[PDB]
Write a protein that binds this ligand. Structure first.
Ligand code: ANP
Ligand code: ANP
Ligand code: ANP
Ligand code: ANP
Ligand code: MG
Ligand code: MG
Ligand code: MG
Ligand code: MG
Ligand code: ZN
Ligand code: ZN
Ligand code: ZN
Ligand code: ZN
Lengths: 410, 410, 410, 410
């Protein structure tokens, strides 16, 4: 299943993954001109394995390779019968074979062909899926860094007009772990979204709209909630916010919103402001106090008899983070640095008492902060209603004990 | 499988799911008039996934809109032999392909040739079942909300006479989670049920009968219960009704019955009365209290050793609900807000003492309530025995301590 | 299925495996001059199984021996239709058959009848895969030793020039457990690496580069990390280092790195310095202290709060190693020499107490070293950030408290 | 399936297995001369399956069956076509059948029909595998007892020459459970082994070599071990030998060696000195003691912190042997004669106390024995280093505190 082509994918079109690009260009240089290797180039690399995560160009270096070198054929893909592949891939074979449908005589057969019946054409296997000599060099095609996000976003950005306010880095930042595909969609749906309202110029506003519709369910506004339900979910979806600021070393607050998306009643967003190299104990502790903040915000205002089963998911991740700290990253003085993840019955008790002590300490801190800053909570409950959504400039105005400015737009 | 029809029924047929309706009418307008590539990147959306629960219009929309643009095709289907037949879709298309026979390279493997041979029709592989680029848009098709229940009900309600007193919403609330087929054939069975007695005009009187039949089971009077057995159930199903009222923040009572249907001697119905997102501590404690109404009625009236295995299913639900509160949804002072749903034996016993304390507190509140209002219980036993069924207005008469009007009908 | 030929390459090819070499020259001698066995040995050695580890010369021996005795065909290999094929290979044959596609008791009476038909051919089923009379004689093909590693390295190093300063043995001990194949690769990639920069011929300077590239990841340099971040990961690696030279009986240090090579920001290499024959109590405890020494550097420099979660994989290695001592090899005075690998709940508590005592003693000792040698840590932190890599000679310079000389090259 | 030979191998080569051989010779005589039915033996055994362990002649009594009676037929060895079989078996062919090829009453049905329809051939199905009428008999083909080892050895020992001082029984005891194939090729490899050095006649000196190459890996002298490593093993293998003698009722020591063979640096051999019928408490305690000889030799000689993980495999067998005695075989005063191999936690504690006490008592005895005889340990350390191997006479020389003579040979 191989086809002769004239125009196909090159290398300069792909972005990011510079190391993978480097190994690709080495293979491309090699594919012809073997005489350059007077140092015994020595069995042109046989077998290339990409163990990268699925979805980020795991097979785009294959397309790039097939187009590259002016070798006019592609992957050979697109049981037993491989030997017919060995037979056909001897004459006029455009320098590779790529085999992704995910019994290893391929090594002996390929060696025999490349030694006897192949005039240094260097047809070798390169494969992608998710011992030395059969898979010698394995090249990782990984998820882009934020720098890479900027590049790819600019690359697909060619096709449209731009309104002045576009800042590619922020849009890149908000997509942690989005592949090339996900960015491609972000742009595409920006275009579609702008068309829906028939807007000539496309700016960052609909851009954020598209990002949101991607990660979370698209806005589902037709649902009705009573007057009081709108009010309660406004406190709980604040409180998350007023704590995100006062606790130390946290990702800053980007958005606080109230209209339901998918299965969620309200959302508070965060922006990593970098890539996750590692975490401090301090910031890990701060996360907990931000998480439970909503339930406390709901209890102080309403009474402990009316606190609702809305904090279920907020509770779960909190308890999951808590026990990881004690169990498998050190972080507890009594037990000491060890890995407890068959133990005794006494040990199973000390682990629990430590977990409870941690959550209790931060829960008290979270309770203390809200009581002192009561004016903000009422001030922020109000604006959350008058306008349905709050951006970053507005939140800072609240947190400074000042007047709220109207949101961007409206 | 291609089926050629010129014209079909309009888009008034689908009701509810307005968000899905929107995210689909964009596709509908796109299918033709692709000249709107003035955003200059508007490449066709992708295979669209409808990932709702089975049973709620997952495929209904097809006929409403496939009439639009007069596409002479349908769902294409209605172990990879397709590929060629997949590439068949280049002439007289519906501007889609639909596949609900529900490995992963199939989409992008053929999409290039698709759009290359697609006449700007916006062909996609929209699919329904229970990495962007192979599937991008996942559109929820959810169960009709209590507002949407009215819309669907009035849609299928164009085919009959109507009695003056019919109210749609009351039937709406009675069917929580009923999908479209449920409502449609509820109307259908209303029609049939009226016809069986040869009553001229349908009405709510049998409408509720149809609901009750489908939801629970046909009422079986062919059973014989002795005289002394009709009396015992009469108390149990009261007591449920007496305590459902005096306890705080409960769904209100609709009707109370004695005729045996399915496997249960008596049923007490509650009306959710306005869909609620989530519940609160007070409501859950009210439910735990009300569930134990019957056993206490039996125990006081008949003695501590004539109680029976009738509260078997009432017990299980109660102890399940009480177990969820302390383990998952916070709601206990001693243990704290944490997910307990492994652990030490000391912790294992605290949870048991906690659930026991909870059940006991509400059980005693239940007994103290029923003891004081002794007369109501007897007064209500008499009515259930005279007329085998009591409606909502009658209960107000009993609870006010005045005489009972005869039921509507009779 | 067998391949006709005339001659093959000599016996200088296979290196090491001298015991296997002998127990193969037996078959080589036997296949010819069978009458030499006047001591009635001429009961042909039946199926010979090579039961070595995979990837280390399991099937390498083909060329030398198939050439010797001038046997002209290879293995036959290259659900039992075979038996006729077993009949087929009895005249003018490879002199034996080899079959690596790995009910089975079928071998004996079949090839016995054949050898009765064989004109003293002595054909056997010599088999490879990862009772007497069918698999009586098996010849192991083990992982190469250091004195063997060096020789294989010299053999494949017949095909290029070398720069004067190459010591084979250092590269030999650098590759523990890797086969002939991995050494083949090391040389091949050395050639390529030299070619890439257009260097005339290669010393060991890039030889180590090839080792690092294969055993670890390639130098993923393209990443950026802030200045304040490198300083965090450069106080850590120095701290596996200075604590690995003040403890007794440890493997010496070779390199320390700051440039990320995969999943790790830093690497500290140790040179095994001899093949592993088992171990000693002192050496195991010293390893335990070396591992935990990294995170103590962070704790002293930045304080107990800002101690990151990068010390994770260090914790696991230590807790398994410390657990294995008191559960499998004796090494605990309280419990005694025994194998605890059910068991009571009292016995489990003692085990955790012993594991914790071990790790506590070594943790405290690894702390007592850095506090006294604070001046080394700062100095080694500077160099690691000045030049990204430190060679062995400078580490000695630092550890002696004198001025640092620049690296080889630069 | 079909093969006729007028004359084949007899049964006098069956040496061994006298008892089953008799039950077979009964049948052999009966196959013809049925006229001895004057007690109605009219009932040839319908089916007897040799239920012995695989590997010991389970197919050699069938071959004897075909040979005997001068009856011209080979047995059928060599999903139901069996009806073919009981069809064909009527051509004046008596009792010449075997089935080890690979719907349940089939054997009895066809057998009855044919033997009723056959001319008194007395046909029976005999099978080999690992209610009378389908399998009436079961005959055991067991492993050769120490008497029978002599018979098989003398049978195969005709071919070679004999050296003067070869003793069969000593080789016999050396192979505790080798089935006839193992003895046969032990002789074979004796012949081969002599041939390599090309000696005139084969003494037992090489016979020990053949046994050692079979039982454990062949000598691997190619390994190089440092000087200080040869001294370490030299002590551990002694110590095993010193405590083996001074402790009561043990299998005596045969040979003690240092050159590595397999995965073990040293091996100490014992001779069972008779068949292992059943063992007693004194003997089992002797074993538990002797095993821990090596670790104590290391600990006294070098120090309490230069011990190693070499006693890893000595520990395990010890804790198994000690665990069986308390749990399965009585042999403990406190718990009593019961099978403990579920149960309360208190009981789990008692068993560990007991196992620990047992190991402790014998360990202390082992220490006290060795310290008193310190000179023997040194004197025996020297001999192992000088000559790599010590035989039986030398151990007596050491233990009497005299001068050592050199081994046979050298
Ligand atoms: N560096 C990149 N620049 C631009 N687009 C990219 C890049 N990497 C991946 N893509 C996208 O990937 C698509 C095709 O690559 P693809 O076959 O998906 O490999 P992949 O993305 O890793 N899929 P998968 O097999 O799950 O890993 C293109 O159409 C792009 O949208
Ligand atoms: N929103 C709706 N409005 C009107 N009728 C509906 C609606 N949803 C479902 N129906 C009825 O349900 C049927 C449509 O069948 P179908 O498309 O299978 O729904 P579905 O049950 O969600 N699909 P599935 O879950 O796989 O069985 C028709 O009889 C419709 O009258
Ligand atoms: N002793 C050796 N000397 C030289 N090259 C060797 C040696 N052992 C292995 N090789 C190389 O390794 C390959 C030998 O064939 P191969 O079938 O891989 O044995 P193997 O590596 O053990 N394979 P396997 O063990 O079945 O996984 C060839 O590429 C040889 O060049
Ligand atoms: N009593 C005996 N005297 C001599 N040789 C014997 C004797 N018993 C078995 N053998 C040898 O055993 C071999 C045949 O063994 P075999 O028929 O397989 O028994 P078996 O090994 O149990 N069959 P199986 O276990 O199913 O593989 C021949 O080489 C015989 O020489
Ligand atoms: Mg891909
Ligand atoms: Mg469906
Ligand atoms: Mg192999
Ligand atoms: Mg056999
Ligand atoms: Zn929340
Ligand atoms: Zn009830
Ligand atoms: Zn570390
Ligand atoms: Zn030992």
């Amino acid at each position: 299943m191989l086809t002769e082509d004239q125009i196909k994918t090159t290398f300069a079109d792909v972005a990011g993954c510079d190391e993978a690009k480097e190994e690709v260009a080495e293979l491309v240089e090699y594919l012809r001109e073997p005489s350059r290797f007077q140092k015994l180039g020595g069995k042109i690399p046989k077998g290339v394995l990409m163990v990268g995560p699925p979805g980020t160009g795991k097979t785009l270096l294959a397309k790039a390779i097939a187009g590259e070198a002016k070798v006019p054929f592609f992957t050979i893909s697109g049981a037993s019968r491989v030997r017919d592949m060995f037979e056909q891939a001897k004459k006029a074979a455009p320098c590779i074979i790529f085999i992704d449908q995910i019994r290893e005589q391929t090594l002996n057969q390929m060696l025999v062909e490349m030694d006897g019946f192949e005039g240094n054409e260097g047809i070798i296997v390169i494969a992608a899926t998710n011992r030395p000599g059969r898979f010698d060099r394995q090249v990782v095609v990984g998820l882009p860094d934020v720098r890479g996000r900027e590049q790819i976003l600019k690359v697909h950005m060619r096709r449209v007009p731009l309104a002045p306010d576009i800042d590619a880095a922020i849009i890149a930042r908000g997509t942690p772990g989005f592949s090339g595909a996900d960015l491609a969609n972000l742009v595409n749906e920006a275009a579609l979204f702008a068309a829906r309202g028939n807007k000539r110029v496309v700016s960052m506003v609909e851009f954020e709209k598209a990002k949101d519709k991607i990660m979370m369910g698209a806005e589902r506004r037709s649902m009705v909630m009573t007057e009081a339900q709108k009010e309660s979910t406004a406190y709980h979806q604040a409180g998350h916010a007023i704590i995100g600021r006062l606790v130390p070393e946290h990702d800053p607050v980007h958005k606080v919103t109230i209209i339901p998306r998918g299965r969620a009643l309200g959302v508070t967003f965060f922006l990593p402001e970098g890539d996750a190299i590692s975490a401090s104990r301090q910031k890990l502790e701060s996360q907990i106090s931000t998480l439970y903040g909503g339930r406390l915000a709901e209890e102080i205002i309403y009474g402990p008899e009316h606190v609702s089963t809305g904090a279920s998911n907020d509770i779960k991740v909190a308890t999951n983070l808590a026990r990881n700290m004690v169990t498998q990253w050190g972080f507890s003085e009594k037990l000491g640095p060890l890995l407890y993840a068959h133990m005794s019955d006494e040990t199973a008790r000390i682990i629990d008492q430590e977990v409870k002590a941690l959550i209790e300490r931060n829960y008290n801190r979270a309770r203390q902060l809200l009581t002192d800053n009561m004016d903000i909570l009422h001030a922020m409950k109000d604006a959350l209603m008058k306008y349905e959504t709050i951006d970053a400039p507005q939140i800072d105005d609240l947190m400074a004990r000042r007047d709220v400015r109207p949101p961007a737009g409206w």
